[PDB]
């Protein structure tokens, strides 16, 4: 899978487990269609949202949704979820891991990009 | 004003100058509709974006344009831009401060929310 | 004063108030002799750490006890401190901020550099 | 093993390869002694550095050489490099997964401590 995304809790200091996530991609209209999603795993990772094949060149948008996972802890966060927009393979096939490090009020997110 | 955006930039140190900002407040169609924008100063600071009278409860979103940031540096970015997605509540601190630490392939963006 | 300090915590979205910042600077005998330090302020700043005539160019430790910080909020924490070790510079801008951003399990320190 | 450690590039956005990393343990008189160290891999990762049988309780500091790296890139960083304090394995033994994201002028650390 050529993308794969990750999930930790800087509060906790441990993945960031059953996270929802959506993943979207612009269409010729303009508009996001929806293209992949699903949750992270107990090690706080989702793959096997697609294929090589499956993902073309464009620009994409990953959402994660921060809230549920905070208020289900207890805790109102300033965020309504984490949204990663990028081009990807432009200049040919590559590996992209999403990562994301979540407090309630700040978030970080960085992208590991490497060849197939 | 009880918005304001305060830009960094991780690679030069320092604040991350003349990067445009699009304030957007979602209508009861579920779309973005403009609110506010403007550019950084030569301290990354981006104020007078909104008054109280105007600044009520909803859902807003802040779009930093990084890309064009890093282009103007002749860096290769990854995000298209950074997004900051939250609900205004009355019922908490008035004052809303979203600084974004800039880098490449990384940023982070935090809430820092305080009384007058 | 050339060096300001300012922390933020991200779990409440606010400065980090009242946090124990210890200066340092490297002797010829390698060690860390006590410089300056102070306590942040209500803003979660801490300034007049030292003058441009006492800051002469050297290694400086930027020692920010953020253990006893989450003690105090309840929250257990993973590090002991934070530590920002630098060299400073005369041939480079004049003025330091150094900004912390912290979680119980992460932080990230950033320096902003700039002229008078 | 039960300490392993991951460096980031976030301006190039990949692994931080070849970085320097020692690690210590303050002994009983209160001085650091060296622990273990080592570079990481192509994937940015370092492994091997202890085991469980060595890893005892204590205080240990990682230090990640993070101004070679960026020197060897042409680049002048702020740091002189990233040091992670922490206590260990006081609630009995656990495995720490310490990262680093990396930029010119900032840097985020996390821990991410799951049980063995
Ligand atoms: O003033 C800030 C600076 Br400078 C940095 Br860097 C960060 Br991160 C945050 Br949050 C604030 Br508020
Ligand atoms: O594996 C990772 C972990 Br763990 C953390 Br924390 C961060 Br930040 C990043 Br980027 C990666 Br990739």
Same mark, same amino acid.
């Given at each position: 899978?050529?993308?794969?995304?990750? =999930?930790?809790? #800087? =509060?906790?200091?441990?993945?960031?487990?059953?996270?929802?996530?959506?993943? +979207?991609?612009? #269409?010729?209209?303009? *508009?996001?269609?929806? +293209?992949?999603?699903?949750?992270?795993?107990? !090690?706080?990772?989702?793959?096997?949202?697609?294929?090589?094949?499956? +993902?073309?060149?464009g620009i994409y948008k990953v959402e994660i949704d921060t809230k549920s $996972?905070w208020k289900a802890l207890g805790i109102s966060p300033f965020h309504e979820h984490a949204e990663v927009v990028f081009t990807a393979n432009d200049?040919?096939?590559?590996? $992209?891991?999403?990562?994301?490090?979540?407090?309630? $009020? !700040? $978030?970080? *997110?960085?992208?590991? =990009? *490497?060849?197939?």
């Open positions: 899978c050529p993308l794969m995304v990750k =999930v930790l809790d #800087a =509060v906790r200091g441990s993945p960031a487990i059953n996270v929802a996530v959506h993943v +979207f991609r612009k #269409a010729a209209d303009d *508009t996001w269609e929806p +293209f992949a999603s699903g949750k992270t795993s107990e !090690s706080g990772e989702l793959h096997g949202l697609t294929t090589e094949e499956e +993902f073309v060149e $996972y200049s040919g096939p590559r590996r $992209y891991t999403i990562a994301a490090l979540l407090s309630p $009020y !700040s $978030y970080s *997110t960085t992208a590991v =990009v *490497t060849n197939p």
